[PDB]
Amino acid sequence: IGRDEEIRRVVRILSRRTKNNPVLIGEPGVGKTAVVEGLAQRIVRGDVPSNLLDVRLIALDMGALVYRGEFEERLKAVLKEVEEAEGKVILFIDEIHLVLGASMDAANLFKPMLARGQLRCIGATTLEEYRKYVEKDAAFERRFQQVFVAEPSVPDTISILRGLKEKYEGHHG
Amino acid sequence: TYGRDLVEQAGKLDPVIGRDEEIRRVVRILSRRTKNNPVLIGEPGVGKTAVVEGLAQRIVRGDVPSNLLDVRLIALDMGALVYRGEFEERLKAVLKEVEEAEGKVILFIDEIHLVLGASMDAANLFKPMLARGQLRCIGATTLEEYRKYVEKDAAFERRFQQVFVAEPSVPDTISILRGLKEKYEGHHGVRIQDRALVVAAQLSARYIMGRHLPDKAIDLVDEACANVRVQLDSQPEEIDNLERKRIQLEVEHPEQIAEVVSRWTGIPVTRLGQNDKERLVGLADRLHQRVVGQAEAVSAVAEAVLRSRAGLGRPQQPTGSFLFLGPTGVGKTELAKALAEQLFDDENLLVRIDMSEYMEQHSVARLIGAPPGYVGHEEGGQLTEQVRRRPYSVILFDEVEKAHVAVFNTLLQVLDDGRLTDGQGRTVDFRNTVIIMTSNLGAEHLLAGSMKVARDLVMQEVRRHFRPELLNRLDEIVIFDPLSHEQLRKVARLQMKDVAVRLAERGVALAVTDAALDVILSLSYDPVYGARPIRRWIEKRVVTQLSKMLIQEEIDENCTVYIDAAELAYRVDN
Amino acid sequence: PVTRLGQNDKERLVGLADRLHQRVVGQAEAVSAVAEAVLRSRAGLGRPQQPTGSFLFLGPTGVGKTELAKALAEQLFDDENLLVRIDMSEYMEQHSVARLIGAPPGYVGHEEGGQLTEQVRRRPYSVILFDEVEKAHVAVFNTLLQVLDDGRLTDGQGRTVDFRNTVIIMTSNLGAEHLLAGSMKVARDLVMQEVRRHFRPELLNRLDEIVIFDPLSHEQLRKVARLQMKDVAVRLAERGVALAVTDAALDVILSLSYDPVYGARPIRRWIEKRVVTQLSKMLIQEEIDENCTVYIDAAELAYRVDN
Ligand SMILES: Nc1ncnc2c1ncn2[C@@H]1O[C@H](COP(=O)(O)OP(=O)(O)O)[C@@H](O)[C@H]1O
Ligand SMILES: Nc1ncnc2c1ncn2[C@@H]1O[C@H](COP(=O)(O)OP(=O)(O)O)[C@@H](O)[C@H]1O
Ligand SMILES: Nc1ncnc2c1ncn2[C@@H]1O[C@H](COP(=O)(O)OP(=O)(O)O)[C@@H](O)[C@H]1O
Ligand SMILES: Nc1ncnc2c1ncn2[C@@H]1O[C@H](COP(=O)(O)OP(=O)(O)O)[C@@H](O)[C@H]1O
C-alpha cells in the first residue's frame, strides 16, 4: 500500500508507442519489487485500463534458468518460444546490469531484437550501476526511461506499519 | 534474401518532408565517374535514416533522373546476416552473388564504422574490391567515429566524400510536426489544437536540455497524446485516487503539454492560479519571519523570485546573483535557509560549496569536471552531477575572497551568459539557479562605527581588492545593517519559542513577561558577536535548571511554569 | 563566396556601413575601418599573403568593444554565435602552448586536438576573437608572430593550416586610467607611449591598425537608453502590450543612475530592476487586459493604463 504514483507512471509510459521500456532506478531497500508486485496485484484484480486486459506477466529467474554454448542456445530458444504471444506478454528481469552490461558476453547478442522492439521489458537496479555501466555505450540509451523511487516521508511509514501489523499479529498471536 | 528490401515498404513507411538539399547532393554525387561513394556524417538524432528513406521513396515514385531508373535498393542487416570462418565465407558468398547486377544495384550499410573499421579483422579483406569499385556504397555514422577510426589509415580516404546534415531551423520543425500530426491523430482519434502544437515547438528548445536538435518534440507531443486518452476516454483517475484515499482512511480507522514538461524536470512553468496569486503576494510576509530587520535583502530576493516567476527577464542570466557583506553572526546564511525552506518543502536541498581547501590552483580539476586524460576515474566534479537531473536548486558559496585568483576566475563565464563546459566537453546549463555568495571583508570598518563614511570605506576597500571588471557583472551588492534593541527582544522571543515548543512536546506550557526578556538581554549581551551568546546563555541556564528540577519529579501533567524577575524566579502551577 | 556579384550584392555592400551603424553608436572610426576592410577583401584586390586585416582595440571598460564584433558577426552571415571566443585567463604558464596548438603525438598523442586546429578546419571563413591579450605569458604570445607575418601555421603533426581569410581581432584594457583622467591629445600620447614601451618595438609594426575608443556624450547616452528601452518593449509586446516613452523620461532615467566611469551597464541594471519589477507586480494583480498601452512620464515616474 501507499505507492499510488509509480504504478500510474508505469501505466502512462507502457502505453506509449515507441521507447516504452521503463527501468526502475533507486537505492536498495525502498520497495522496487514491492511496487512491481503492486502492479501485478493491480493487473490481477483488473483495475488497470482495459488496454492491457489480455497480458500475462512472466518473470525470469537466473538460478532457475542456470557449457556457455548450452546456456546461450537455451536462452535463445526461450526468447524464440516466448514470441508466440506477439506483444501480449511482459517480461520482467531483476538485476539487469549484471546479466546484460557484463565476464560473459551477451550485450551484442541482446542488442538486435531489443532494438527491433520484440517485447516490452522492465528492469531494476541502483543508480551507481547506471552511472558505471550503461553510460559508457551509446546503444542502450536509445530506449529505457528513468523512473525515480524514494521514501523520505516519516508519516507514510506509520501507514505501512499499520498495514503490515496484521500478518505479524496473526503469526505470533 | 538475407538482407532487406525497401521498395515495397515505402507504401507504409511514414512520409518525410523538408529535406530537399541532401537528396539533391546525393543525386549529384552518385552520377560522378570516380569516387562516387557518399557517406552521411552528423550527430545522432537528425534523420540520416529519414533522408535515406526519402531517397528510396523518390526512386520508387520516379522523380529521380532517368539515369537511375534501372536500379533496386538493397539494405544489409547485421543481425539478419549473423564459427567466424563460416560468417566470413557466407558474407563472401553474398558479395559475389550480388555481382549479377553489375552496376545496377546500390548497397546500403548502417553503422559502417563498427563492422568495417574494426576485434574482427575485415578491413584488409574489404579493401581490394572496394578500391576496385565493384559497386556503389552508402554509409552513415557520427563525426567522432570519423575522427578516431578512419583518419588513422591512408587507404579508405581514397574514396568517400563528407556530407553534412543538421537541423538548426526552429520554423522548419513546425512543418515536420504538421506533417507527422496525421498519423498520431489517426492512431489516437482525439481532437487536437494548433496553438498547443506551436507552443510545444517553441518550448521544446529552451527548458528541456539534453538529447539533441529540436526534432525531439515528437516525443513531447506524443506523451500528452497518450496521457489524454487514458485520462478521458478510459476510466478517470481522479475518482480512483479519491477511492484509494478513502480506502486508506478506512484502513487507518495547450495547458496539457505544460504539465508533462513541468513534471519532467521541475521548473513549474504551468499556468498560474489564485492560489499562486496569494502565495506570491504573501511570499515577502512569510519570508519576513525567520529574519528580523533586514528589509533590503528580503525585498531584493522577493522581487527577484517574483520577476523570474512572472514570465519576463533576460533569458541569458542565472536570474539573479548577490553579494552579502557584513559583520559575523548577523544572519547571512539564515536568509538563504529560510528562502530554501519557503521555495519548496525540502529543508536541505540547497548545495553548500566552500573553498577552505581550495587554496592551491591544482583543485580546479576536482572543482570542475576533470579531463579523462590520465585515468578518467574521478570525472565527477564538484558542480557537475548535483545540478544535473535537478536544475532548480540553489547554490550557496562561502568566504569567496579566501580562494585563489585562478580557481575563482573560472566562474566568470557562467555569470556572463550562463552555460559551462567541463573536461568531457558536455555543456551544463545554469539557467535557473540562484547564485548567492558571501564574504567577511570590511567587518572592522563597519563595527568601528558615521555610518556613511563606514559604508564608503567598505565599498572602496572591496573595489580596490577585486578587479574592476567582475564587480560589474554582479546584479546587486548589499550590506547588512547591525540590529537594535527591538530586534534583540524579537530575536530573543524567537529563540525561546524553540525550547518552549520542544518542552511542550512533553506536555508542559511556557509563559514569560517583558522583564524576563529585558534581564536576559541585559545580562549576556555583547555588541560584537551578534546573537549567539543569547542562545548559549539561555540554554545553559534555563534548560539545565528545568531538567534538574524535573528529574526530582516536581512536575506533573498539565503544569505551567512561570518566569519573572526578582534574576529569575520559577513558579510551578497547574 | 567568390561567385560573381550582382545588384543585390551591390546595394548590400553599399549599405553594409549603415546597417552596422545601428548596434554601435558614435564609433565612426572603428566602423569605417571594418567596413572598408571587408569591402576591400570582397572586391578582389589586396595582398594574398595577409589575414585580410588585424586590429587592436584600446579603451575604457564597458564601452562596447565586443559589441562591434558581435554585430559584425551577425551582419556578415545569418549565424549569431559562430564566432570562436579564445581567452588566455588560464594560460599564464608557458606549459599551455601544447594545448593552445596541436600537441606533438610523442607521449600518448591522445589530446592532439588543439585550441586553434579543428575549429578553423572545415570552416576557414570564421572570425577569431582574442581577449585581454596583455595578460598572457611572453612565450605563449610569441607564437602567433608567424601567422601575422605571412599566414599559415604548423602544428605538432606537421600539417599546415591556412589563416588566409580569417579576420583576427584583439583587445586590451591598458591605458584606461590615463584616458579616463581627461587634454585628450596628451592622454592619447600617454597611452600610445605606454603601449609602445610595454611591448616589443617589432610586433607593433605588423598590426594593420590600432584604434582608441572615444568616450561617449549625452546624445549617445540618450540613444543607447532608447535602444535598451526597445528590447524590453518588444519582449513585453510579445504578450500583446504596447510601449511608449517621452524625452523627459529618458532624461530622468539617465540623470538618476549615471556614472561616467562604468559606461552603460548601470543604466540597464537600474531600468530593469525598477521598471520590469514594477510592471510585473502591477500585472500580477490583473490590472492589464488585451489592447492596453502603458505610458510613462515624469512627475520620478507615473504609470497610466489606457486602451
Ligand atoms: N509499501 C510497502 N509495504 C510493505 N513492505 C514494503 C513496502 N515497500 C518495501 N517493502 C519491503 O521492503 C523490501 C524491499 O526489498 P528490495 O528493495 O527488494 O531489496 P533489494 O533492493 O536488495 O532487492 C521488501 O521485502 C518489502 O517487505
Ligand atoms: N524530416 C523528418 N520527418 C519526420 N521524422 C523525422 C525527420 N527527420 C528525422 N525524423 C525522426 O528522427 C528519427 C531519426 O533517428 P536516427 O537518426 O535513425 O537515430 P540514430 O542516429 O540513433 O540511428 C526517426 O525515427 C524519425 O522519426
Ligand atoms: N532574525 C535574526 N537576526 C539575527 N540573527 C539571527 C536571526 N535569526 C537567527 N539568528 C541567528 O544567527 C545565526 C546564524 O549565524 P551565521 O550568521 O550563519 O554565522 P556565520 O556568518 O559564521 O555563518 C543562527 O545561529 C541564529 O541563531
Ligand atoms: N552603442 C553602444 N554604446 C555603448 N555601449 C553599448 C552599446 N550597445 C550596447 N552597449 C552595452 O555595452 C555592453 C558591452 O560590454 P563590453 O564592453 O563587452 O564589456 P567588456 O569590455 O568587459 O567585455 C553591453 O552589455 C551593452 O549593454
DSSP string, A67-104: -HHHHHHHHHHHHHHGGGSSSSEEEE-SSHHHHHT---
Q: Which residue blocks in C80-137 are alpha helix, DSSP H?
A: 97-100
Measured distance CA(B462)–CA(B465) in Å, rounded: 5
Contact B310 C265 (CB under 8 A): no
Pair C112, C102: CB distance under 8 Å: yes
Sign of CA dihedral B546, B547, B553, B559: positive
- Look at B475 and C269 and tell me if their CB atoms are within 8 Å: yes
Q: Of all helices (H) and strands (E), which one includes residue B164?
A: strand B161-164
Place of cell 537511375: B68
Residue of B234, B439, B306 lying closest to C273 (CA atoms): B306
Distance B45 CA to ligand 2 centre (A): 6
Neighbour count for residue C48 (Cβ, 10 Å): 7
Query: Which atom of ligand 3 approaches the CA of B440 most closely?
Result: 21
**Burial degree of B257 (CB within 10 A; 0-12, 13-18, 19+):** buried
Secondary structure class of B29 (helix, strand, coil): helix
Contact A6, A147 (CB under 8 A): yes
- Rg (C-alpha) for chain A, rounded Å, is 18
DSSP, collapsed to helix, strand or coil, labels residue C172 as: strand
Segment holding B504, helix H or strand E? helix B485-504
- The DSSP result for chain A, as a single string, is ---HHHHHHHHHHHTSSSS--EEEE--TTS-HHHHHHHHHHHHHHT-S-GGGSS-EEEE--HHHH--HHHHHHHHHHHHHHGGGSSSSEEEE-SSHHHHHT-----HHHHHHHHHHT-SEEEEEE-HHHHHHTGGG-SSGGGS-EEEE-----HHHHHHHHHHHHHHHHHHH-
Please provide the DSSP assignment of C280-302 as one string. Answer: HHHHHTT---SS-EEEEE----E
SS3 C211: strand
Residues in A closer than 8 angstroms to B237, CB to CB, are 8
B472/C61 touch (CB, cutoff 8 Å), yes or no: yes
Question: How were these coordinates obtained?
Answer: cryo-EM
User: One-letter amino acid identity for C91?
Assistant: Y
Rounded to whole angstroms, how far apart are CA atoms B555 and B549? 8
Q: What are phi and psi of B402, to 5 degrees?
A: -70, -10
Residues of A at the B interface, defined by Cβ within 8 angstroms: 1-2, 4, 8, 11-12, 15-19, 47, 49-51, 111-113, 116, 138, 159, 162-163
Distance of CA B193 to the CA centre of its chain: 29
C99 close to C111: Cβ distance less than 8 angstroms:
yes
Please answer whether residues C117 and C161 qualify as being in contact, where contact means their C-beta atoms are separated by less than 8 angstroms: yes
Q: Is B527 helix (H, G, I), strand (E, B) or coil?
A: coil
Amino acid symbol at B248: Q
Say how many residues make up chain A.
173
Which chain B residues touch A49 with a CB distance below 8 Å?
Answer: 230, 234-235
Ligand 4 proximal residues by C-beta, below 6 Å = B 469; C 23-25, 61-67, 224, 264, 268
Task: Mention every residue, 6+ apart, whose C-beta is less than 8 A from residue A72.
Answer: A106, A109
Burial call C183-213: b when 16+ CB within 10 Å, e when fewer = eeeebeebbeeebeeebeeeeeeeeeeebbb
Q: Read off the C-alpha cell for B372.
A: 579523462
Kindly write down the DSSP assignment for every residue of B53-117, as one continuous string: HHHHHHHHHT-S-GGGSS-EEEE--HHHH--HHHHHHHHHHHHHHGGGSSSSEEEE-SSHHHHHT
CA distance B186 to B196: 18
Angle of helix C7-20 relative to helix C28-43, nearest 10 degrees, comes to 160
Q: How far is the C-alpha of A93 from the C-alpha of A60, rounded, in Å?
A: 6
Handedness of CA A42, A44, A46, A51 (dihedral sign): positive
Of C186, C85, C199, nearest in space to C141 by CA: C199
Q: Which of chain B's residues have a Cβ under 8 Å away from the Cβ of C232?
A: 312
Ligand 1 pocket residue status of A129, Cβ below 6 Å: no
Please answer whether residues B508 and B561 qualify as being in contact, where contact means their C-beta atoms are separated by less than 8 angstroms. yes
Of A16, A50, A163, which has the smallest distance from its Cβ to B222's Cβ? Answer: A16
In three-state secondary structure terms, C77 is coil
> How far is the alpha carbon of B303 from chain C, nearest alpha carbon, in Å?
7
Q: Which three cell numbers stand for residue B312?
A: 519576463
- C208 phi and psi angles, rounded to 5 deg: -65, -45
Is there a contact between B392 and B209 (Cβ–Cβ < 8 Å)?
A: no
Distance of CA B28 to the CA centre of its chain: 43
> Among B32, B556, B531, which Cα is nearest to B291's?
B531
Asked whether the beta carbons of B64 and B27 are under 8 A apart, the reply is yes
Cβ-proximal residues to C43 (8 Å cutoff; 6+ apart), any chain: none
Cβ atoms B196, B223 nearer than 8 A: no
Chain B interface with C: residues with Cβ < 8 Å: 277, 280-281, 303, 306-307, 310-314, 371, 373, 406, 409-410, 412, 468-469, 472, 475-476
- Residues B434, B319 contacting (CB under 8 angstroms): yes
CB burial string B377-386: b at 16+ within 10 A, e below? eebebebbee
In a 10 Å sphere around its CB, with 0-12 CB exposed, 13-18 middle and 19+ buried, how is residue A112 labelled?
middle
**To which H or E segment does residue B143 belong?**
helix B143-145
Q: What is the DSSP letter of B15?
A: P
Contact B312 C90 (CB under 8 A): no
After which residues are there C–N gaps above 2.5 Å in chain B? 82, 118, 253, 449, 566
Residue that the C-alpha cell 516613452 belongs to: C245
Q: Which SS3 state, helix, strand or coil, does residue C188 take?
A: helix
SS3 (DSSP) at B322: strand
Sign of CA dihedral B460, B462, B468, B471: negative
User: How far is the C-alpha of C225 from the C-alpha of C249, rounded, in Å?
Assistant: 10
Which ligand is nearest to the Cα of residue B175, counting in written order?
Answer: 2
| DSSP 8-class letter at B42 | -
DSSP-based three-state secondary structure for B148: helix
Q: Say if CB B20 and CB B55 are below 8 A apart.
A: no
Which residue in B186, B183, B135, B130 sits closest to B159, CA to CA?
A: B130
- DSSP code at position B207: S
Cα–Cα distance for residue pair B297/B479, rounded to 1 Å: 9
> How far is it, in rounded angstroms, from Cα B396 to Cα B333?
9
Residue C143: CB atoms within 10 A of its CB come to 13
Are B316 and B418 spatial neighbours (Cβ–Cβ below 8 Å)?
A: yes
The burial class, CB within 10 Å (0-12 / 13-18 / 19+), for C121 is exposed
Pocket test for ligand 2, best of B13, B14, B16, B174 (most atoms within 8 A of CB): B16
Asked whether the beta carbons of B389 and B347 are under 8 A apart, the reply is no
Rounded CA separation B55/B136 (Å): 15
Q: Where are the beta strands (DSSP E) in C101-221?
A: 127-129, 153-154, 160-161, 167-172, 209-212
Alpha-carbon span C236 to C292, nearest angstrom: 12
Q: What are phi and psi of B476, to 5 degrees?
A: -160, 140
Residue of C80, C221, C20, C30 whose CA lies nearest to B417: C80
Query: Using CA positions, which residue lies closest to atom 22 of ligand 2?
Result: B44
Give the residue ranges of DSSP H helices in B290-372.
295-310, 332-343, 364-367
List alpha helices for C161-260, DSSP H.
176-181, 184-198, 218-237, 247-256
Residues 6+ apart with CB under 8 A from C186: none
Phi, psi (rounded to 5 degrees) for A138: -95, 5
Cβ–Cβ below 8 Å for A51 and B234: yes
How far apart CA C189 and CA C210 sit, in angstroms, is 13
User: Which of helix, strand or coil describes residue B394?
Assistant: strand
Q: Is B574 helix (H, G, I), strand (E, B) or coil?
A: coil
Q: Can you name the residues that pair with C210 across neighbouring β-strands?
A: C56
* Residues near B150 by beta carbon (within 8 Å), at least 6 away in sequence: B113, B117, B156, B157
> Closest partner residue to B244 among A4, A17, A112, by Cβ?
A4
Radius of gyration of chain C from its Cα atoms, rounded to whole angstroms = 24
Tell me if B320 sits within 8 A of C277, measured CB to CB: no
Amino acid at B159: R
Q: Cα torsion at A113, A114, A115, A121 (round to 10°)?
A: 150
Nearest CB neighbour to B472, from listed C232, C265, C280: C265
**Under an 8 A CB cutoff, do B280 and C284 touch?**
yes
Beta bridge partners of B249: none
Query: Buried (b) or exposed (e) across B317-351, using 16+ Cβ within 10 A?
Result: bbbbbbbbbbbeebbbeebbbbbbbbbeeeeeebe
Among B116, B140, B256, CA closest to B196: B256
Question: ∠ CA B233-B239-B240 to the nearest 5 degrees?
Answer: 90
